[PDB]
Amino acid sequence: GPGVGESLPDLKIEKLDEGVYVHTSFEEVNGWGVVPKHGLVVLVNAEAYLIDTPFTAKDTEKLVTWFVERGYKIKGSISSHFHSDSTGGIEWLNSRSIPTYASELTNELLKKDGKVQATNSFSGVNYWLVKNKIEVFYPGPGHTPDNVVVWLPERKILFGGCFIKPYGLGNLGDANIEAWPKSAKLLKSKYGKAKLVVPSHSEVGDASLLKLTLEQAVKGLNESKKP
Amino acid sequence: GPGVGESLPDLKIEKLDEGVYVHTSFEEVNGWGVVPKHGLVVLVNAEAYLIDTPFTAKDTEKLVTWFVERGYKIKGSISSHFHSDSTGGIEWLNSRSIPTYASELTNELLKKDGKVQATNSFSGVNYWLVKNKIEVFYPGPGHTPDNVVVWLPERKILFGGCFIKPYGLGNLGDANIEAWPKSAKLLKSKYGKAKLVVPSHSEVGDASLLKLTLEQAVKGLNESKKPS
Numbered sequence: 037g038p039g040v041g042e043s044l045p046d047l048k049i050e051k052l053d054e055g056v057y058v059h060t061s062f063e064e065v066n067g068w069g070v071v072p073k074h075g076l077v078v079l080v081n082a083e084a085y086l087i088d089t090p091f092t093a094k095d096t097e098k099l100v101t102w103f104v105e106r107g108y109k110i111k112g113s114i115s116s117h118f119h120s121d122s123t124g125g126i127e128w129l130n131s132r133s134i135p136t137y138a139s140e141l142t143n144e145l146l147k148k149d150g151k152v153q154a155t156n157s158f159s160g161v162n163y164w165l166v167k168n169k170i171e172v173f174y175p176g177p178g179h180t181p182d183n184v185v186v187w188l189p190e191r192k193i194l195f196g197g198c199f200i201k202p203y204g205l206g207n208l209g210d211a212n213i214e215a216w217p218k219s220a221k222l223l224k225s226k227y228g229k230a231k232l233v234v235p236s237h238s239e240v241g242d243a244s245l246l247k248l249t250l251e252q253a254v255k256g257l258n259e260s261k262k263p
Numbered sequence: 264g265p266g267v268g269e270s271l272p273d274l275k276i277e278k279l280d281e282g283v284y285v286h287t288s289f290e291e292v293n294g295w296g297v298v299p300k301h302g303l304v305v306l307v308n309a310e311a312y313l314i315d316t317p318f319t320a321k322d323t324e325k326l327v328t329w330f331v332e333r334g335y336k337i338k339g340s341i342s343s344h345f346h347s348d349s350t351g352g353i354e355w356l357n358s359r360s361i362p363t364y365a366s367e368l369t370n371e372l373l374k375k376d377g378k379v380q381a382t383n384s385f386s387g388v389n390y391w392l393v394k395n396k397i398e399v400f401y402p403g404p405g406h407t408p409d410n411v412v413v414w415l416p417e418r419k420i421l422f423g424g425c426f427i428k429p430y431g432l433g434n435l436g437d438a439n440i441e442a443w444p445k446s447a448k449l450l451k452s453k454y455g456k457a458k459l460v461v462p463s464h465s466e467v468g469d470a471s472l473l474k475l476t477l478e479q480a481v482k483g484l485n486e487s488k489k490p491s
C-alpha cells in the first residue's frame with residue numbers, strides 16, 4: 037500500500053562471502069504475508085555495487101548510508117527486472133547521481149508503467165557490468181519478460197533474482213509460463229556449478245536451487261494447461 | 264474494510280510432495296491487508312489427515328469435499344494451536360463425526376475462550392498422530408503457550424505452524440516472548456535436517472527458516488525488554 041508498514045522488520049545486511057553482502061528488505065504484500073526481498077552489495081576496489089535495490093527509497097538510503105559511512109562509496113546499482121522490489125530505489129539513486137543500470141527492455145517496462153528509468157541501459161543477452169567480476173545474463177522470459185541474472189565469476193555466486201523460485205513461482209501477474217521451463221533449463225546448464233544461488237524471495241542455496249526452479253516451472257506450465 | 268461483495272482469494276490446494284498437500288485460506292486483517300494461512304493435508308493410502316483446519320466452517324467443508332471426491336476417507340484433523348486459523352472448522356468436523364485432535368492445553372484454551380473443543384486430546388511432548396508417519400512435537404511456548412509442530416519423518420517436512428516466524432513474530436497478544444528463544448533453539452536443534460519447513464503465514468522454505476525464527480525470537484525478546 038502507499039503507507040509505511042510500521043511493524044515490518046528493518047533492513048538487514050549480512051556478509052555472504054568475501055566480496056559480497058546480502059541485503060534483505062521487507063514489505064507487506066496483499067495476499068502473501070510479509071515478503072522478504074534479497075539483493076546484493078558487491079565490493080570492487082572497495083566501492084559498492086548494488087545488485088537490485090530494496091523495495092523502497094527509505095531502505096535504499098539506509099543501505100547506501102551503511103556502506104558510505106564505512107568508506108564504501110557507491111559505484112552503481114543494477115536492477116534485475118522492472119518490479120519495484122528490484123527497482124524501487126532507482127529514483128533515490130538517480131537523485132544522488134549514482135549511476136543506475138537496467139536492460140533496455142526493463143527500462144521500457146518501467147516507462148510503460150510511468151516509473152523512473154535507470155540512467156544506463158544495455159541491449160542484448162550478456163553485459164559485463166564489471167569485466168570478470170559482475171556479469172549480467174538474460175536466460176529468456178520467466179517470472180517476467182525482462183528478468184536477468186547477475187553472475188560473480190570469482191565467487192561462483194549467482195544472483196537469480198525473482199527468476200529463481202524453488203518452492204513455487206510467486207506472483208504470476210507478469211510471468212511467461214510457456215517460456216519459463218526453457219529459460220530455467222538454459223540457466224541451469226550455464227550455471228550448474230555455482231557455489232551459491234541467491235533467490236529474491238527465498239534464502240540462499242546451492243546450485244540445486246536451479247533444478248528446483250526448473251521443476252517448479254515445468255509444474256506450473258502443466259497445471260496451467262487445464263481444467 | 265473490503266466491500267460486502269468482496270470475497271478474499273479462494274481456498275487453494277497444492278501438491279507439495281508425494282504424500283502431502285498445502286491448503287491456503289485467507290482472512291483480512293483490517294488495514295494490514297489479506298493474509299494467507301497454510302495447513303497440510305497428509306495422505307496415508309487413501310486416508311487423509313488435516314493438519315490445521317481453515318479459518319472457517321465453509322473452507323473446512325471445501326477442503327474436505329475436495330479430498331472426498333478424489334476418493335479419500337477423512338480420518339481426522341489436528342490443530343497446531345488454539346487460534347481460529349488452526350481450529351476454526353473443528354465445530355464443523357465434529358458435526359460430521361470426523362475425529363478432531365488437539366493438545367490438552369489447546370483444548371483447555373478453546374474451552375476458556377468459549378470455543379468448541381476437539382474431541383480427542385493428547386498430552387506429552389511427542390505424540391504420534393499416525394505411527395511412523397505423522398508426529399506432533401511441543402517445542403515449548405512461543406507464538407502461544409500451546410503451539411505444536413507436525414513432522415513427516417518420511418518426507419522430512421516440518422509443518423511449523425504459527426511458531427515459525429522468519430520475518431517477524433507477528434501479533435504477541437497471546438505469546439510467551441520470554442520462552443520463545445529457548446523453544447526456537449530446541450526446535451532448531453531437533454529438526455535442523457528438515458528438507459522443507461512450512462510456516463502458517465509465509466511461504467515454504469528449507470531448514471533455514473528454523474534459524475530465522477530463532478533470530479526473530481531473540482530480537483523480539485530484546486525489543487520488548489529495552490526500557491524505551
Ligand SMILES: O=C1CCc2cc(-c3csc(COc4ccccc4)n3)ccc2N1
Pocket residue numbers: 067068203204205252255272275277278279285286287299300301466467
Ligand atoms: O511446488 C509447489 C507449488 C507452489 C507452492 C505454494 C505453497 C503455498 C502455500 S500457501 C501459499 C500462499 O499462496 C497464495 C495466497 C494467496 C493468493 C495466492 C497464493 N503458497 C505451498 C507449496 C507449493 N509448492
Ligand SMILES: O=C1CCc2cc(-c3csc(COc4ccccc4)n3)ccc2N1
Pocket residue numbers: 065068069070071119120121179198205206207208237465466
Ligand atoms: O510492487 C509490487 C508488489 C511486490 C511484488 C512481488 C512480485 C513477485 C513476483 S514473484 C514473487 C514471489 O513472492 C513470494 C515468494 C514467497 C513468498 C511470498 C511471496 N513476488 C512481483 C512484483 C511485485 N510488485
Ligand SMILES: [Zn+2]
Pocket residue numbers: 117119121179180198
Ligand atoms: Zn518480480
Ligand SMILES: [Zn+2]
Pocket residue numbers: 119121198236237
Ligand atoms: Zn520479486
Ligand SMILES: [Zn+2]
Pocket residue numbers: 344346348406407425
Ligand atoms: Zn495463532
Ligand SMILES: [Zn+2]
Pocket residue numbers: 346348425463464
Ligand atoms: Zn496463525
